Amino acid sequence: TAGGAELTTHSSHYLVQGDNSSGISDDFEPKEFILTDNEMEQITNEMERNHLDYLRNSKQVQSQLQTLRSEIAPHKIEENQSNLDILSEAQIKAGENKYSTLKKLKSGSTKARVAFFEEL
């Protein structure tokens, strides 16, 4: 009528074994736990959405921020701008933010990133 059999059991996970010898010293529990790869990825998806939710709920403030920036732009003393000021203006011109940049960099392989590190 019916039949089954369980075949491959495979696990991919992070083992965390804490110790109160040095560093952060509080006695938290659980002191030892395991997080599967997918628990980690699900937490990462959830964090991206929390941030994209915050960007969505602040749309009025971000709009205001660019209004103010335009309104005072006539008074700018470019000769008093800094290194970082110019970098920041380039970043905005190119549509970049802190998180999309980091997400883009991490999408490359760890092998690629170590080698990229090495020809700098």
């Binding site: 560093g23 952060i24 997080l35 920036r69 008074h75 970098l87 960099l105």
Partner: protein, 302 residues
């Protein structure tokens, strides 16, 4: 018999300690006195007999940790600071006291230009800072002197515009009036939510060199290890997340980083101050602990 002053960003503590007191004993007294339970972010910073800035260790005695006493009239002086930063303040900071200690430390970091902030954003931040100190905007109480101090905006912002101080003040007040139905700790969190998105927020910067003797910045963060070009501190050139790193060690000036992927080569960088090299080690171990603990939330309860 040990005379101690601890300064948080909010308050000061003067008391005595037994000569047998450990760092843990001092840390606990400070935390319990101010009512802080989210202690994992914080540390006791001092200057040692080599005029190195250090963090108090927990299970050695206070008097065995080479605190400089001479320039202080024999008082042990410490700054209680946040050494580690949450990834998202909204989800992670539980107590008002914790939030307030982060608000003050981050704001001073922006006003002093320890972390870059854009002009129009510093005006948003300043409109919240005003709300924190004076409560919701109220035409009844508002006096121009509330904003008239020159301490609301970073110097780098006002220096790069030909504007009077009052043009700045009015552009702060306009926003201050605009967002008034808010408690104090609600606007502190709004401040922090803006600040945590700044590119330099939460990055511990250290000067390093790679194999090729290229000058780089190592950025130790709550998420991993950022690598910056020597002249761009906003945008990392590459990065490595905490769960990708298996082991960190230094010998002399040489840091060796090993990755979880056994197929990938270790990589090296050089950092010339031995004392800095131990602080880099400590920031790596501490941020990595919290990275995993964040992802097992029961470990973060109070």
């Amino acid at each position: 018999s040990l005379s101690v002053r601890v300064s948080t960003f909010d308050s000061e503590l003067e008391f005595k300690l037994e000569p047998r007191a450990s760092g843990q004993d001092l840390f606990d007294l400070v935390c319990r006195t101010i009512g802080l339970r989210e202690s994992w972010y914080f540390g006791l910073q001092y200057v040692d007999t080599r005029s190195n800035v250090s963090w108090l260790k927990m299970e050695k005695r206070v008097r065995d940790q080479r605190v400089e006493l001479h320039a202080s009239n024999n008082v042990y002086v410490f700054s209680f600071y946040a050494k580690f930063f949450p990834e998202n303040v909204s989800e992670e900071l539980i107590q008002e006291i914790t939030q307030h200690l982060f608000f003050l430390q981050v704001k001073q970091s922006i006003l002093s230009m320890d972390i870059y902030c854009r002009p129009e954003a510093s005006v948003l931040l300043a409109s919240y800072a005003v709300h924190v100190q004076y409560g919701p905007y109220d035409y009844e109480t508002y006096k121009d002197g509330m904003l008239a101090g020159g301490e609301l905006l970073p110097k780098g912002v006002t220096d790069q515009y030909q504007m009077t101080p009052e043009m700045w003040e009015e552009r702060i007040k306009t926003w201050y009036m605009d967002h008034e139905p808010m408690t104090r700790d609600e606007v502190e969190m709004e401040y922090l939510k803006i600040a945590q998105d700044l590119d330099m927020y939460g990055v511990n910067y250290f000067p390093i060199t790679n194999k090729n003797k290229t000058k780089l910045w190592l950025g130790v963060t709550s998420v991993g290890l950022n690598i910056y070009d020597e002249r761009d501190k906003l945008t990392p050139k590459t990065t490595f997340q905490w769960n990708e790193i298996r082991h960190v060690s230094f010998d002399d000036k040489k840091f060796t980083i090993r990755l979880v992927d056994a197929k990938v080569s270790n990589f090296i960088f050089y950092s010339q101050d031995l004392h800095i090299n131990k602080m880099i080690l400590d920031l790596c171990k501490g941020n990595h602990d919290l990275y995993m603990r964040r992802r097992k939330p029961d470990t973060m309860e109070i």
